[PDB]
Design an enzyme around this catalytic site. Structure first.
Site, mmCIF file in Angstrom:
data_model
loop_
_atom_site.group_PDB
_atom_site.id
_atom_site.type_symbol
_atom_site.label_atom_id
_atom_site.label_comp_id
_atom_site.label_asym_id
_atom_site.label_seq_id
_atom_site.Cartn_x
_atom_site.Cartn_y
_atom_site.Cartn_z
ATOM 1 N N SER A 242 0.832 -1.187 0.000
ATOM 2 C CA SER A 242 0.000 0.000 0.000
ATOM 3 C C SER A 242 0.877 1.251 0.000
ATOM 4 C CB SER A 242 -1.032 -0.049 1.087
ATOM 5 O OG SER A 242 -0.465 0.199 2.353
ATOM 6 N N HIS A 272 -2.102 -8.707 1.433
ATOM 7 C CA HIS A 272 -1.766 -7.529 2.231
ATOM 8 C C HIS A 272 -2.791 -7.212 3.323
ATOM 9 C CE1 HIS A 272 -0.187 -3.109 2.479
ATOM 10 N NE2 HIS A 272 0.258 -3.907 3.414
ATOM 11 N N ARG A 327 3.527 -4.002 17.682
ATOM 12 C CA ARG A 327 2.136 -3.684 17.361
ATOM 13 C C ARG A 327 1.189 -4.690 18.031
ATOM 14 N NH1 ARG A 327 1.983 -2.969 11.090
ATOM 15 N NH2 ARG A 327 3.129 -4.919 11.344
ATOM 16 N N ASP A 373 -1.722 -8.701 13.253
ATOM 17 C CA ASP A 373 -3.038 -9.186 12.836
ATOM 18 C C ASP A 373 -3.537 -10.364 13.686
ATOM 19 O OD1 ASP A 373 -3.412 -7.319 10.591
ATOM 20 O OD2 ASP A 373 -2.070 -8.593 9.371
ATOM 21 N N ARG A 399 -3.476 3.834 7.544
ATOM 22 C CA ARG A 399 -2.341 3.906 6.640
ATOM 23 C C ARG A 399 -2.335 5.237 5.889
ATOM 24 N NH1 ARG A 399 1.098 -0.281 5.495
ATOM 25 N NH2 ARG A 399 0.965 -0.339 7.769
ATOM 26 N N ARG A 419 10.417 4.450 -12.305
ATOM 27 C CA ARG A 419 10.421 3.879 -13.648
ATOM 28 C C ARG A 419 11.591 2.904 -13.758
ATOM 29 N NH1 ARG A 419 10.534 0.929 -18.109
ATOM 30 N NH2 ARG A 419 8.973 1.532 -19.668
HETATM 31 O O1 LIG Z 1 2.444 -5.998 6.577
HETATM 32 C C1 LIG Z 1 3.475 -5.444 6.160
HETATM 33 O O2 LIG Z 1 4.227 -5.919 5.295
HETATM 34 C C2 LIG Z 1 3.803 -4.069 6.709
HETATM 35 C C3 LIG Z 1 2.498 -3.332 6.750
HETATM 36 O O3 LIG Z 1 2.017 -2.977 5.694
HETATM 37 C C4 LIG Z 1 1.803 -3.282 7.823
HETATM 38 O O4 LIG Z 1 2.366 -3.135 8.889
HETATM 39 O O5 LIG Z 1 0.601 -3.339 7.736
HETATM 40 O O1 LIG Z 2 7.282 3.534 -20.862
HETATM 41 C C1 LIG Z 2 7.128 4.564 -20.144
HETATM 42 O O2 LIG Z 2 7.810 4.795 -19.114
HETATM 43 C C2 LIG Z 2 5.992 5.528 -20.493
HETATM 44 C C3 LIG Z 2 5.287 5.078 -21.747
HETATM 45 O O3 LIG Z 2 5.732 5.538 -22.798
HETATM 46 C C4 LIG Z 2 4.221 4.222 -21.755
HETATM 47 O O4 LIG Z 2 3.854 3.658 -20.714
HETATM 48 O O5 LIG Z 2 3.613 4.013 -22.818
#
Ligand SMILES: O=C([O-])CC(=O)C(=O)O
Ligand SMILES: O=C([O-])CC(=O)C(=O)O
Lengths: 435, 434
Positions: A242, A272, A327, A373, A399, A419
């Protein structure tokens, strides 16, 4: 002094210079290698991104800008008469790297109450969703639809300086956080309280209390739990799906609304977002079978059976967590104080004392301790929130705090588009026959 | 044997075994290094993921399962009386790695025709969305709301085998693809044709033709451009924000609807899918400031003036490509053929003559050549599709084919949760010092 936006404006240049210094000193320094396994393995153990708000301390669990959960429990302001940290104060810490004063948390509560109004089209949308549209999808869609209010979306076409991106991200983020409890509560009521109204925001209440009012709860202890719950699920590094999704979508300059909505799509993933629920389904099934006064002996045996069937104990499976997730611990201590007689809580604490040892005996993880959890569902259930389909929405509201705090900083620091390069299996087979 | 799902069932074991072997031997082969700059630079140049459907050569551009776009224009089936490849055939190619027969493409057209129905709550949501809600937000919210039709979400809750995830991913993917034109056409009509209905699906038309029918167009060459537009925007490797977002969200076993809707939120960003419009608005500001007549000297000047003041030419760079985008060249060839006297087209062609040199002489151009977005707007506008907010919705519809095709394979091959390690600057300084 009291205005978070002006405090943050003073913090941003120091952090920008800090980072520029480190890049100028160490930009070309190799921090790891990428193997073929890591590409197939979902970048596992690949240092992929910079994320400032929280870091996993491999002994002491998650740290929020350097502060452990026990420290946040100690240091963060509380409601008048409460023991549990206000999520506002956690957000302040995430954004500023500093512990707020009670006056700063109080200003932030007022600011969030004043931005909380939903546009009519979102209310209408929500009122028209059917019962079979999962709560998380309703949250995601509603958040997407809120992007009509985005300050940041307009200003990029208008040619606003990059230097000012963070300011609009901040505005949009403050607006989204303020609105999330109203969205979340409308979804709750539509789904489970016959579409009755969420009522009104009180300008003088903290965010968690406005949220529990809107859900239709009136139980000081549930509001205390909610405060703690929203604080502790707020952030967990940038690698989780997330957080990573908000960062990726955010790096394209999509506004906080679209970023978060994407992030909730990711949180809705059953790898998740669904663990809270699977643990509770299991505990319920366990207690009904073996009764509420089961002996350790008989409990230990049942666990051994489950393990030898090639099955897992839901909620016990750690990362590098050489201890129990803090937690879990803060939820446990909460339970010990306020609901020690609860049968399902008693089953949870009994597993806690039994399961780690059984997991160590078996050839399994070198960490057998419970994740967050394993404890969450029994607390929610206890306070009458039995609608397990909705649990991940609470996670999502939490979150928001972490991913939005980081989103502000990503823009203030000018992180570019995420990217990476991809390769096919055919490409990677060639790539390795050469060189 | 014949059904796409059966052909895919036969292909999956073979690809799984071939990868299992590859990772046995070569799993530990280093392909690349991570540097601090890459972490702060958005993973630029970092070999981050396996994405099977397409691969982007920086020099030669996109290949779809090893086929260049020119190869696809030749080999891929066309509609009857048509010259442009059917998107259906592109999807077949991405899914199977094989060029489809005309029968296979015909079968796929019918298959998406039969699946195209929208549930009533989604129709209603679209009909109630206000005019100020961006079309891309509309698309995202509608797709998320379609997740009530996810067979993959419902099957996973009942504990379906891991070995069978790809199958429900495929059904939900085929359903989403079929529905997208209806969603997209409803958005268009609700915003820009006063709520007029979208009409019906004809089960014997191809997907791009049913879509132009629903948009309200009745122009052979418009349908042809769509067929072209929807093929060439379909996929661009795994690392682009929309494909990476879909892959990331999908890795958490989110269904194709939620994965795609996340992708759309990423596509809606200014640095990703809004460049088409950004190009067009700039060319228009340019066209009013000189006119049809502008000379190479005047234009070359205007460009210099733009660069010297540290402004940029929209559409003339890329994160990966370092030559003319083949998707540009495709649209250039379309234009040269079907609208060579278009003034806006004339300017875009002049710019191709001039800008790439201006950028190379200067020197700070890592890629001096145009990308797809430099050319797409003028084609659309030429056929009466002048609502520039909507352009990203077309890109979105196209991109569904690439990302959903890869999502079937990501589940088929059991790609895990994507979970890179993040660092704080503070933590990273300390790690480097160790
Ligand atoms: O679960 C995980 O990988 C870490 C997280 O997102 C959370 O604490 O909720
Ligand atoms: O490839 C990229 O980073 C952006 C792009 O041109 C596409 O998603 O078509």
């Amino acid at each position: 002094s009291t205005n978070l936006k002006d405090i943050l404006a003073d913090l941003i240049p120091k952090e920008q210079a800090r980072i520029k210094t480190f890049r100028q000193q160490h930009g070309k320094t190799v921090v790891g290698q990428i193997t073929v396994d890591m590409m197939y393995g979902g970048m596992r153990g690949m240092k992929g991104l910079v994320y400032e708000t929280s870091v996993l301390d491999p002994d002491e669990g998650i740290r929020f800008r350097g502060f452990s959960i026990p420290e946040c429990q100690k240091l963060l302001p509380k409601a008048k008469g409460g023991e549990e940290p206000l999520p506002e104060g956690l957000f302040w810490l995430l954004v500023t790297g500093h512990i707020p004063t009670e006056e700063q948390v109080s200003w932030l509560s007022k600011e969030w109450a004043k931005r909380a109004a939903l546009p009519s089209h979102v209310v209408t949308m929500l009122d028209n969703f059917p019962t079979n549209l999962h709560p998380m999808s309703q949250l995601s869609a509603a958040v997407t639809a809120l992007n009509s209010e985005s300050n940041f979306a307009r200003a990029y076409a208008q040619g606003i300086s990059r230097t000012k991106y963070w300011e609009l991200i901040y505005e949009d983020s403050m607006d989204l956080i303020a609105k999330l409890p109203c969205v979340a509560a409308k979804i709750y009521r539509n789904l489970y309280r016959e579409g009755s109204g969420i009522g009104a925001i009180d300008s003088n209440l903290d965010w968690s209390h406005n949220f529990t009012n809107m859900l239709g709860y009136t139980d000081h202890q549930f509001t205390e739990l909610t405060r703690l719950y929203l604080t502790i699920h707020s952030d967990h590094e940038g690698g989780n799906v997330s957080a990573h999704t908000s960062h990726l979508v955010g790096s394209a300059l999509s506004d906080p609304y679209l970023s978060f909505a994407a992030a909730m799509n990711g949180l809705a993933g059953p790898l998740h977002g669904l663990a809270n629920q699977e643990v509770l389904v299991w505990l319920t099934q366990l207690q009904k079978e073996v009764g509420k006064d089961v002996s350790d002996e008989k409990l230990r045996d049942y666990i051994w059976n489950t393990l030898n069937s090639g099955r897992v104990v839901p909620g016990y499976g750690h990362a590098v967590l050489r201890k129990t997730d803090p937690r879990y611990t803060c939820q446990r201590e909460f339970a010990l104080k306020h609901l020690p007689n609860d049968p399902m809580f008693k089953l949870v604490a009994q597993l806690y004392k039994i399961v780690p040892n059984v997991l160590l005996e078996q050839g399994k993880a070198k960490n057998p301790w419970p994740n967050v959890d394993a404890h969450s569902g029994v607390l929610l259930q206890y306070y009458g929130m039995t609608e397990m389909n909705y649990y991940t929405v609470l996670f999502g509201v939490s979150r928001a705090l972490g991913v939005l705090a980081q989103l502000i900083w990503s823009r203030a620091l000018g992180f570019p588009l995420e990217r990476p390069k991809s390769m096919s299996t055919e490409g990677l087979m060639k790539f390795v026959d050469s060189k």
